[PDB]
């Protein structure tokens, strides 16, 4: 017995196939398409070469009088431009009538949507047409290939060599394509240059003092200096044939990157310090400090920069430009070029005399690091204390339980650690006893043994015994010293509980208990339904009496919608999330008919109901909720996740009034530029709509939409609009205004900078990342440490609980 095969070959797409005819395009055809697309909502930002390519994908369609083109209520896919004849319209089976030059079905280019009108042909007329799939696919291909071409051209430009991978990708998105006709001047001699040009196609002639010097082709570039200095152009460059250039202006580069020269030297110094066996062990913040504080100096060629015994405060040097030679008395040790460095032994032993000599081999630039520079940046006169301090800090800043404590709290915790020794065979912890110490291995190896079964071996910088800080319980496993000379850092529970305060302790006490509880489906009892894909049940775990949420999703509903890859990806993202303001997944389950997600139960209600109870937010209330979202979003962007559906509906409050981001169905791990149109229209960024690619920046746009809601009340774009097209039009072209009762300069500026249409110029989307938002004057009185450390009073704490109402899982 064999199954038959069976739909979707009888829509409006199949109707257009019947009317399709072949037609070679004339000059009258292309020009007529170019004009209609340039006036259209999606294509008005596009250049001529993109519009020309799109214009070639237009198909020709022929209609006799009485033939239906579009019917009302049918799902729409094509966009049309009337080539000849008249076409009547029926608004609710009744309105307009339009002929050559006009267009319709614009919304179809963006999204699959029901047709408003129904257009019948009045006379023997013809249409130019294109389908959504082809249109979006074409924009995707134009943008992707443009970016990749421009990226490999950036790699050939030597002034950008010391940019990082992320920084090069950033400046690639700052490239503007510029097309030039034959005989057109690209740059003129004596003009003050602020633009770097790279030839993509064509040829240009270089003239100096009216004399023909040379010809530039694909891959040639000029104006490197124009990105650094403000000087006269050295030559006049005129296009010889039709020519395309990628250009980057200094103005946009300074927005994207800041001072290019500063960034390059910072990167050289930062990479040099990361090769040092001493400077390796310090944090990125400390290395950026050393880089930003180092004395930078130029020296001439064949110059003794440092000479045995005559050196005073200088302990370390990094070559930024040129070359120097390192000597010990008369013996040559080596040549240091860009990014190489010297002085480890003098950094470690700052009182010992300088015995080396550094002589320049050519004109050079050097970064000098002194005793004062080290003390100020590494925060101590003693270097071994600093190293020791940061070794502990690095380890605890990775752990959930310590990393959201404040800098004061974290510093008190680090100072409290003491050292103890153990020999081969010693039990550091014995299974059974009630523990009270947390351990970090400084030197040696230890075995973890649970119920006589070796679980794993831990070594230098691993940690154990964490739960004893939160709970008074018996120890679940023993920890035995593998070898002699084992040394641990340790801190006692009692000190941790002095440092930490009530709210944060309760958060950790609840979270770790529920996380670590091994839960089976046998052991759960449904209490009530709290959400209607599938259902969300408030469940109760009988052995521990801990309460959870259990989201159930129909396995048959997933197969029928081809969400098999998407549910795997949702699980993967939802599982990795470990942040206090993001919902925490405990476990997943699988059976014959369902996929289950078991999460923490969130009891404080929805954010969308909190803001309606509070009304328009005060500055501190808006700071609190926006700040919370910022930290959650920042967490995700650090892991290359774009959330894509940020809105108050997807944010719950916990018992304490702190927020939890939920619903990761729209989230994606970004690998390059994303193109699929996903989200809630009122919150969707313009770069999602326009279809030329996007990444993590879309969440920062939505953040500005949310802030506007909080302070002003209504949505900034499309507030009183149901129809999706008109919402999108307002997002793309509408004027951003504020009510008469919103006047706070810092609130207005932040909303304006967050709702910048160009993602490249949007606050938070430059080199400093979220730091620019966090340091914005709007947050000037806001303590980010206290937010994450649960030390702020929230705007709203609820009196009771409120709720709405193959595969490896």
Numbering used by the authors: 15 to 20, 23 to 110, 112 to 549, 552 to 824, 850 to 853
Paper text:
Previous work has demonstrated that one particular kinase, known as cyclic guanosine-3′,5′-monophosphate (cGMP)-dependent protein kinase, or protein kinase G (PKG), has essential roles in multiple stages of the parasite life cycle. Selective pharmacological inhibition of Plasmodium falciparum PKG (PfPKG) blocks the egress of merozoites and gametes from erythrocytes, as well as inhibits the motility of ookinetes in the mosquito and invasion of hepatocytes by sporozoites. The cellular functions of parasite PKG are regulated by allosteric and cooperative binding of cGMP, similarly to how mammalian PKG is activated. In contrast, PKG enzymes of Plasmodium and other apicomplexan parasites have an extended N-terminal domain that features four CNBs upstream of the KD and are monomeric, resulting in an effective regulatory stoichiometry of 4:1.
